[PDB]
Design a protein around this ligand. Structure first.
Ligand code: BEF
Lengths: 49, 328, 208, 49
RNA sequence: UACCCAUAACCAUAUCUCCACAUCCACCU
């Protein structure tokens, strides 16, 4: 569940990144950044109850 | 001190040579206090949100909605003048929405752009009713006077008066009936309202909006508390308590006890709302480094910081210009 | 011009002045000789400027010159607090205020060294009297000097009059801003930071 | 804590019991001399030394 | 005023650093 929450965050991020993106040959870099999902998983495994 | 010239026990009290600090520990920062001079008044939250609303009981104001809506939202209260009529009788402390208020403030005004180069059938001082055909296609809405420009039409529920002599009331003044408007006793005011004189057609137009109090929020409350006198209210509550039965006298005494408490305890309710906000000594809210240069801070510091930012933004905004909605 | 100094310094300056006219008057000599030479220099310089000359006079120990004058000055008349003649300074005062700027060509610029904070009333009194006569002041603190930092100028107290007259509107206004900036900066720390800042470029180059 | 143990909570139930007896100065010393009065505690330490 | 008369300037007094809060797990009533 925590993974899918982080994944949805990443999905919204990539939605925005496409939204202001112009060209198309940008699949790996200009679409996905690991910060949201990684931070969510780390937070769940560290500071959860 | 900052420099340390006159510091020593022979001459600690002698004012410092390059400095002005009397010898003391850090305990001054435990006790010495700051303040913030807000450009706009504000009310202590306790007196407006406590279950018996001290503001809401000292004044005839509803605590749950009226007090907050005037005090936060754009609502207007007004003491002096309410005799203007909107299908509703005179007003003394009534609460009215800023829409209908702003309406009654400057008459009953409507504007209609007119095509340039087309002389509309309506002249400068033509009375217009609803349905009257102002042009091959234009129709007004209500009984009033329509003002013509080359290229615009101005429908005002005001009264026009031609005259051929000097002006007694210039442009800007707001007049009461019977007061001389122009031409001496030949023309006199008929209703409350403001006077605008146009010499192009040599005519006085009188709107139906008299000079009435317009206030929002804490300043308004201050005005109320400034104009409130405790002794007369105390006597009035006495009579309103002694005569009737128990139900009304219950709330009568519930507010009379507060009024008596104010009157007999000294401090007048004008400063019941606060203009300058005190600032706690720094050591009571210290920013202490934890590790790696990071500073743990009491939330009081954050609250003061936010308040300072808002106050400075208000000062700058009021200094530069006044977009009314933005100012509110 | 040198008064009341040590002869070895006289030799040092005289050899190291590269031909510029150094006149000296050691404390060894009777002070009457000191007054004689000083006033003869005064009159000669007055004649030279009277001939439209540009004359630079570098006077030694102007407050200690006043002390030397008081040495030459017996009576004090009514004893001022400190013991100086009513007409004593009028000779130094004429000598100093004679330095001036004329529209007719030539000039007389006199710069002199003042000994102050000497613990006695005479020097402080003379410091005050000639403070209101000079058009420019340059205080040099003991604390700056003890740290072996030279020039040990007390920057804040130092200054001139009528900058715009001597300095152009661009120049005068830009140091108007410059003083508005530097007036806050602490003296010694101003020394280091402005020293670094002006080691980058020439003064005008710094403005450039 | 880490450096020194810290004192003991004296709460209110202990305060209530202490004043339930006729103890008057005991509570005064334990609330001011031994706990809070900085000048008081410094003076007390110096005096007892 | 100068004999009296004129004086005001330079150094030695100490309980603190962090520990705040949140979450969680335990112990004694
Ligand atoms: F003696 Be001041 F410069 F008037």
């Amino acid at each position: 569940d925590q993974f899918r929450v982080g994944l949805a965050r990443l999905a919204r991020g990539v939605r925005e990144r496409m939204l202001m993106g112009s060209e198309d040959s940008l699949t790996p870099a200009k679409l996905v950044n690991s910060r949201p999902l990684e931070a969510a998983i780390r937070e769940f495994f560290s500071r959860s109850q | 001190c900052a420099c340390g010239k006159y510091k020593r026990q022979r001459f600690e009290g002698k004012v410092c040579e390059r400095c002005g600090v009397e010898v003391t520990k850090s305990i001054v920062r435990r006790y010495r206090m700051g303040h913030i001079e807000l450009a706009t008044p504000a009310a202590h939250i306790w007196f407006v949100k406590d279950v018996p609303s001290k503001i809401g009981t000292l004044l005839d104001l509803s605590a749950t909605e009226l007090e907050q809506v005037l005090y936060f939202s754009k609502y207007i209260v007004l003491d002096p003048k309410g005799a203007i009529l909107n299908g509703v009788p005179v007003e003394k402390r009534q609460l009215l929405t800023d829409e209908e208020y702003r309406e009654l403030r400057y008459g009953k005004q409507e504007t209609y752009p007119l095509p340039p180069g087309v002389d509309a059938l309506v002249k400068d001082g033509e009375e217009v009713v609803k349905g009257q055909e102002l042009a091959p296609g234009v129709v007004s809405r209500l009984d009033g006077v329509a003002l013509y420009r080359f290229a615009s039409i101005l429908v005002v529920k005001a009264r026009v008066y031609p005259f051929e002599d000097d002006v007694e009331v210039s442009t800007g003044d707001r007049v009461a009936p019977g007061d001389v408007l122009a031409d001496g006793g030949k023309v006199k005011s008929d209703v409350y309202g403001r006077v605008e004189v146009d010499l192009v057609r040599n005519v006085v137009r009188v709107v139906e909006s008299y000079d009435i109090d317009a206030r929002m929020g804490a300043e308004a409350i201050q005005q109320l508390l400034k104009e409130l006198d405790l002794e007369a209210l105390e006597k009035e509550l006495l009579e309103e308590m002694k005569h009737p039965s128990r139900a009304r006298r219950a709330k009568a005494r519930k507010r009379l006890e507060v009024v008596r408490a104010f009157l007999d305890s000294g401090n007048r309710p004008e400063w019941m709302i606060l203009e300058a906000v005190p600032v706690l000594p720094p050591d009571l809210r210290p920013m202490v480094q934890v590790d790696g240069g990071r500073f743990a801070t009491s939330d009081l510091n954050d609250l003061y910081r936010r308040l300072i930012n808002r106050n400075n933004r208000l000062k700058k905004l009021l200094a530069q210009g006044a977009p009314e909605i933005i100012i509110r | 011009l040198l008064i009341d100094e040590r002869p070895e310094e006289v030799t040092d300056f005289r050899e190291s002045v590269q031909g510029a006219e150094v006149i000296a008057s050691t404390f060894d000599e009777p002070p009457q000789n000191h007054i004689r030479v000083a006033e003869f220099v005064h009159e000669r310089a007055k004649r030279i400027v009277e001939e439209g000359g540009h004359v630079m006079i570098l006077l030694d120990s102007i407050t200690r010159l006043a002390r030397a004058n008081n040495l030459v000055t017996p009576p004090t008349g009514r004893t001022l607090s400190g013991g100086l003649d009513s007409a004593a300074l009028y000779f130094p005062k004429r000598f100093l205020g004679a330095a001036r700027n004329i529209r007719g060509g030539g000039s007389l610029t006199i710069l002199a060294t003042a000994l102050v904070e000497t613990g006695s009333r005479m020097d402080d009194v003379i410091f005050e009297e000639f403070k209101g006569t000079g058009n420019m002041e340059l205080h040099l603190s003991r604390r700056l000097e003890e740290r072996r930092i030279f020039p040990a100028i007390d920057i804040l107290k130092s200054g001139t009059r009528r900058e715009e007259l001597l300095l152009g509107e661009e120049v005068t206004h830009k140091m108007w801003l410059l003083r508005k900036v530097l007036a806050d900066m602490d003296p010694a720390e101003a020394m280091e930071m402005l020293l670094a800042r002006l080691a980058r470029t020439k003064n005008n180059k710094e403005f450039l | 804590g880490k450096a020194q143990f810290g004192g003991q909570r004296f709460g209110e139930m202990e305060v209530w019991a202490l004043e339930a007896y006729g103890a008057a100065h005991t509570l005064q010393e334990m609330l001011t001399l031994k706990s809070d009065d900085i000048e008081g505690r410094n003076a007390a330490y110096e005096a007892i030394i």
